[PDB]
Design a protein around this motif. Sequence first.
Motif, PDB file in Angstrom:
ATOM      1  N   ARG A   1     -31.915 -45.678   2.180  1.00 31.96           N
ATOM      2  CA  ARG A   1     -33.689 -45.323   1.786  1.00 31.96           C
ATOM      3  C   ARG A   1     -33.701 -47.028   1.603  1.00 31.96           C
TER       4      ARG A   1
ATOM      5  N   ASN B   1     -21.294 -45.434   7.996  1.00 32.94           N
ATOM      6  CA  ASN B   1     -23.357 -45.528   9.097  1.00 32.94           C
ATOM      7  C   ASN B   1     -23.633 -45.104   8.153  1.00 32.94           C
ATOM      8  N   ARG B   2     -24.124 -45.673   6.538  1.00 40.92           N
ATOM      9  CA  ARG B   2     -24.368 -44.609   5.773  1.00 40.92           C
ATOM     10  C   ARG B   2     -25.471 -45.215   6.137  1.00 40.92           C
ATOM     11  N   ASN B   3     -27.048 -43.170   5.161  1.00 43.12           N
ATOM     12  CA  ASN B   3     -28.392 -44.105   4.689  1.00 43.12           C
ATOM     13  C   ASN B   3     -28.507 -44.472   3.766  1.00 43.12           C
TER      14      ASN B   3
ATOM     15  N   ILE C   1     -35.982 -43.601   5.099  1.00 44.62           N
ATOM     16  CA  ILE C   1     -34.643 -43.782   5.262  1.00 44.62           C
ATOM     17  C   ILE C   1     -34.426 -43.840   6.920  1.00 44.62           C
ATOM     18  N   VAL C   2     -32.981 -44.421   6.970  1.00 42.92           N
ATOM     19  CA  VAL C   2     -32.873 -45.373   7.854  1.00 42.92           C
ATOM     20  C   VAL C   2     -30.866 -45.080   7.822  1.00 42.92           C
ATOM     21  N   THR C   3     -30.545 -45.313   9.073  1.00 42.67           N
ATOM     22  CA  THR C   3     -28.808 -45.902   9.064  1.00 42.67           C
ATOM     23  C   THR C   3     -28.611 -47.220   8.669  1.00 42.67           C
TER      24      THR C   3
ATOM     25  N   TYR D   1     -30.927 -50.109  10.018  1.00 41.56           N
ATOM     26  CA  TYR D   1     -31.167 -51.379   8.997  1.00 41.56           C
ATOM     27  C   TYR D   1     -30.861 -52.952   9.273  1.00 41.56           C
TER      28      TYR D   1
END
Length: 424
Positions: free
Chosen positions: A59, A55-57, A64-66, A70
Amino acid sequence: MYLKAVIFSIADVVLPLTSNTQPQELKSRIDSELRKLFAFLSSKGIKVIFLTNKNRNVRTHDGIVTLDEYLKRKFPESIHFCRELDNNIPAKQTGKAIDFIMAALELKRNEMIYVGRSQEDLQAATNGNTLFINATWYEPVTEYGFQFSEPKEIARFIDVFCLREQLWGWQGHFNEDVHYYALAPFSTYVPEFTMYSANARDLAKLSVGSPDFWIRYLGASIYFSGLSEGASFITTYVGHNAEDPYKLANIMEHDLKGLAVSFKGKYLKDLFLRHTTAIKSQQARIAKQEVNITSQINTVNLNPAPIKNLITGERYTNPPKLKGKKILVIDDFCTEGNAHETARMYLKAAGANVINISWLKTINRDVSICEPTRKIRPWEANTLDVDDINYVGTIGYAENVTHGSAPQVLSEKIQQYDNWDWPQ
Ligand SMILES: O=P(O)(O)OC[C@H]1O[C@H](OP(=O)(O)OP(=O)(O)O)[C@H](O)[C@@H]1O
Ligand SMILES: [Mg+2]
């Protein structure tokens, strides 16, 4: 229906990974085309699934969201299977994540296809025995075909080949090891008919359709009819001329390699050898002379040293292991079955299970099923007498044409495919 969910990986599909430098115009265009694809799938009742490890951030020009947030914002009503967010989900690479998705959605395996690009995703789909849809709009692939260069091409593939009940125009079986399929009936009994263009100045070398059209037709019909399940090899038959036996294979090799990759199988381009030039069956028929199957049996055999590495040219050092293996045999058109029955005779003698597939089924000609009375030694030249053939049965034309199938229907499918655009 056949297709009920499409699994998408993220890397180099929804978000680029390999490159820092994708132009913003590309990401915006891909985002918009993915929006269209998902809306198209939703309109058809086909679920959109995302399968990820982390569950990468991400941009955004907003912040910034997970990854989960996103995808939920940009592509709402998708279902996100993220291993980091659900420890239930088994690993992608081994194919087990597909079993988990199948159970969660109560879907059969070949009710889904898998869109990816990364090697892990190719492994996840093929080890999970799910049709792999190689998305190459962020990172190209040159080694083989059956690719999908933008999201629109996935919608084109689904709309044209995956939503109608009839995947085959003609199909029939005999005994327990004889299985015949053809994409469409067609008139091949005219002196004018040829599957290959008359002019070498044309960029189209097929007289009917195109490589993209036919490989996607084949891939859809083979997959959703279950024929790809457990298939180890795909191969094509050989032309009558020993000096030019691989005409179809040379046009279709690039794409057949990619379809084999998508099935976790191998394309053996030269598994059959035409060791001696044979009577051209089509030409014999137009000369109104009878075609006998020994004209094929006596001029072909299995290649003991086919190409193993189509990049390198390295050949097998011992004959390929076909015993107990399922092989899809492709030819351009099937009239009375001389070619396919010869292909089947040799492969069956080598211990294989055989599926005989053709693009076209000649109208109003029945297929005669044959078994040899002389033992075949399939890795060498065999010479049989006409009396060495046991004619055991028939797969008829008329009773095995599928509902609504017709040569004009193939023509309109080609038109539908060639001119395809987002259905408005
Ligand atoms: O079902 P069948 O009765 O075998 O007829 C169909 C076969 O005939 C044609 O090949 P042909 O032998 O005319 O040679 P070519 O491919 O070299 O033109 C066609 O390409 C198939 O191989
Ligand atoms: Mg032929």
